[PDB]
Amino acid sequence: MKLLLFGYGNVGKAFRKLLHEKRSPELNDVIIGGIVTRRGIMLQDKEDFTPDLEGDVFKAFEKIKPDIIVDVSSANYNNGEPSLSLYKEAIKDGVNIITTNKAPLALAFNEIFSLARSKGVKIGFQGTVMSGTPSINLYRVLPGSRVIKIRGILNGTTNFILTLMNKGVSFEEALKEAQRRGYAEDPTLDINGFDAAAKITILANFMIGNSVTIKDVKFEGINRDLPKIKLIAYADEKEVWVKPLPISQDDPLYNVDGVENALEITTDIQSILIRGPGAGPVNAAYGALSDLILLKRDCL
Amino acid sequence: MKLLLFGYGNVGKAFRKLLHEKRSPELNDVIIGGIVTRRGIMLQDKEDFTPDLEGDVFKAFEKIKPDIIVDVSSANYNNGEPSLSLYKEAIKDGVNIITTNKAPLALAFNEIFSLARSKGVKIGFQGTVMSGTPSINLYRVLPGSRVIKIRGILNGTTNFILTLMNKGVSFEEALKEAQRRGYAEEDPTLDINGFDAAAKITILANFMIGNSVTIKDVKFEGINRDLPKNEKIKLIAYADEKEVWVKPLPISQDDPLYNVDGVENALEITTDIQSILIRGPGAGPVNAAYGALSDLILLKRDCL
Numbered sequence: 343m344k345l346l347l348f349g350y351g352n353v354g355k356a357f358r359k360l361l362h363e364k365r366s367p368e369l370n371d372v373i374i375g376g377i378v379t380r381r382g383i384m385l386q387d388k389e390d391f392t393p394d395l396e397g398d399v400f401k402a403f404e405k406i407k408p409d410i411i412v413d414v415s416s417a418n419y420n421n422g423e424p425s426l427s428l429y430k431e432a433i434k435d436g437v438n439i440i441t442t443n444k445a446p447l448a449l450a451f452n453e454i455f456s457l458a459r460s461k462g463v464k465i466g467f468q469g470t471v472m473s474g475t476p477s478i479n480l481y482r483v484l485p486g487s488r489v490i491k492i493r494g495i496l497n498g499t500t501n502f503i504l505t506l507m508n509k510g511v512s513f514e515e516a517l518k519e520a521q522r523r524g525y526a527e528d529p530t531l532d533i534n535g536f537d538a539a540a541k542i543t544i545l546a547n548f549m550i551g552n553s554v555t556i557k558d559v560k561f562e563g564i565n566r567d568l569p570k571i572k573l574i575a576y577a578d579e580k581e582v583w584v585k586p587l588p589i590s591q592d593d594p595l596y597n598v599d600g601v602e603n604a605l606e607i608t609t610d611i612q613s614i615l616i617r618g619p620g621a622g623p624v625n626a627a628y629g630a631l632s633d634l635i636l637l638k639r640d641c642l
Numbered sequence: 643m644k645l646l647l648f649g650y651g652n653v654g655k656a657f658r659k660l661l662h663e664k665r666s667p668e669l670n671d672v673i674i675g676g677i678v679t680r681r682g683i684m685l686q687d688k689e690d691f692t693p694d695l696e697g698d699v700f701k702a703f704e705k706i707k708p709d710i711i712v713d714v715s716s717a718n719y720n721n722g723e724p725s726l727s728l729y730k731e732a733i734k735d736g737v738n739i740i741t742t743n744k745a746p747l748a749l750a751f752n753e754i755f756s757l758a759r760s761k762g763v764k765i766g767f768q769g770t771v772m773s774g775t776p777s778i779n780l781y782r783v784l785p786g787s788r789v790i791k792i793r794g795i796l797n798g799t800t801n802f803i804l805t806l807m808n809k810g811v812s813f814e815e816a817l818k819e820a821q822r823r824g825y826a827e828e829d830p831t832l833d834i835n836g837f838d839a840a841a842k843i844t845i846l847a848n849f850m851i852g853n854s855v856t857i858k859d860v861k862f863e864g865i866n867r868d869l870p871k872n873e874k875i876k877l878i879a880y881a882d883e884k885e886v887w888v889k890p891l892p893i894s895q896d897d898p899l900y901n902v903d904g905v906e907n908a909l910e911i912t913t914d915i916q917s918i919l920i921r922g923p924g925a926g927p928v929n930a931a932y933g934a935l936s937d938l939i940l941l942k943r944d945c946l
């Protein structure tokens with residue numbers, strides 16, 4: 343089984359490392375046929391990236407003819423490209439996709455998945471939401487029950503800032519500490535709620551079946567005007583949004599502090615919550631590796 | 643696909659109802675060929691149990707020749723029987739097993755699963771731990787990661803009582819109320835001794851850690867009116883590579899288990915990649931039945 347690895351920043355590097363740690367017998371026959379970055383194409387599996395040829399991901403794809411594309415490349419939220427068109431091409435060729443790149447799915451989930459379903463091609467995307475903590479894949483083991491609503495904390499930086507504030511720290515001092523720890527840079531991009539909006543978009547599509555794109559989400563982030571508040575991401579059959587809200591002591595999200603993420607899935611039978619880390623390159627890479635193993639099991 | 647349902651108390655009845663709700667196209671070809679209880683064998687799928695034949699689970703198995711045995715019978719922790727011998731004979735016949743009965747797995751995990759692996763037979767056992775909240779099945783979507791330790795609240799009855807005790811309710815009334823809701827018998831000794839949590843942590847340690855323990859290896863204690871006041875107490879089950887135990891402990895406010903209240907259960911799984919926690923109802927017949935239904939759908943997908 344031959345992979346094309348698209349992207350070789352921290353996530354791709356972590357992915358290649360996990361793959362070589364021989365973590366499952368299901369991966370014994372898996373090799374990386376090539377790695378492609380903005381610097382070119384390496385037609386070898388090596389720790390260090392050195393391009394053998396110039397060319398983009400489509401050239402790599404045509405040259406290598408992989409069984410699976412693993413997309414760990416940078417999220418382009420302008421238009422999802424080249425990943426969006428690449429996935430459609432791969433699907434039409436019966437090439438499976440494993441991705442940690444949120445953009446194509448936040449922009450065009452139904453387009454991609456409708457096509458995959460029609461061709462019987464599998465898509466792993468666990469690493470797009472809550473990284474290595476089963477979210478997408480948690481729903482895979484909740485068969486036969488309709489999801490009514492989902493609610494979560496889906497961004498660690500804003501959760502960390504709000505955690506400090508509930509403990510009596512001012513917004514200004516809490517933000518500074520997030521910056522000190524490297525969670526926020528202009529911290530504007532890190533605290534605007536967009537990241538959570540991209541994630542809840544994907545969850546909503548997959549779990550509820552609400553064809554939604556990022557433009558449909560009503561989102562906002564955190565700022566000095568906030569007074570225990572959490573940045574809540576929510577989806578149901580009617581709407582998708584992200585907003586700061588007061589959280590009761592009755593709430594299983596109450597204790598979800600620091601950089602931790604959490605997802606509460608409410609079905610006709612029960613409400614369950616999972617919590618874990620939601621970021622980190624090893625974590626995201628592990629979401630992808632998990633999808634790879636499930637794919638080898640024929641369980642996507 | 644033909645099922646033999648062993649047991650028909652509240653979980654078996656809920657399971658039958660869930661199946662008849664047509665919740666997945668994966669189950670369209672599934673029928674119940676027979677239901678067996680202490681009262682005999684019903685060779686029909688009926689809401690109400692009326693025996694057609696006298697005889698036990700082995701007779702039912704011989705007659706029906708099911709593709710899958712769904713065991714929702716009561717756990718016999720003395721020796722695991724008849725479920726333990728039934729599973730070994732079923733595995734030898736290439737018959738898959740879905741179970742909510744902890745005893746055979748708490749007593750003979752490695753043997754049962756080794757036999758199953760050698761025959762290519764699948765065992766769903768999600769309903770044995772945390773009912774319908776993915777636990778066993780959560781680990782199924784954590785492939786290629788090494789579990790370092792697990793810690794959780796694994797018994798609904800005792801969590802319900804300890805939650806009430808934390809609110810000024812006497813142990814005696816909390817017990818009385820647990821009894822009233824169908825959580826403890828009129829003699830509640832065996833409902834509160836910590837054994838159920840011990841059997842669950844045994845199964846989790848075997849499956850997730852590869853710690854080949856049986857019930858006899860677990861240090862466990864239960865609850866009673868004598869527990870410390872001024873602290874919120876939870877019955878904590880724990881396993882790592884070295885030890886497995888269950889005991890009532892005072893819980894700190896920053897502990898993720900602090901607010902796991904009522905009949906809610908929770909499991910904290912620490913792996914080489916990450917520490918995660920899952921929480922959901924740990925008691926309720928529909929919930930346990932849904933654990934088994936989830937396994938049945940996963941089986942049909944060939945994902946056990």
Ligand code: NA
Pocket residue numbers: 872873874
């Ligand atoms: Na206290």
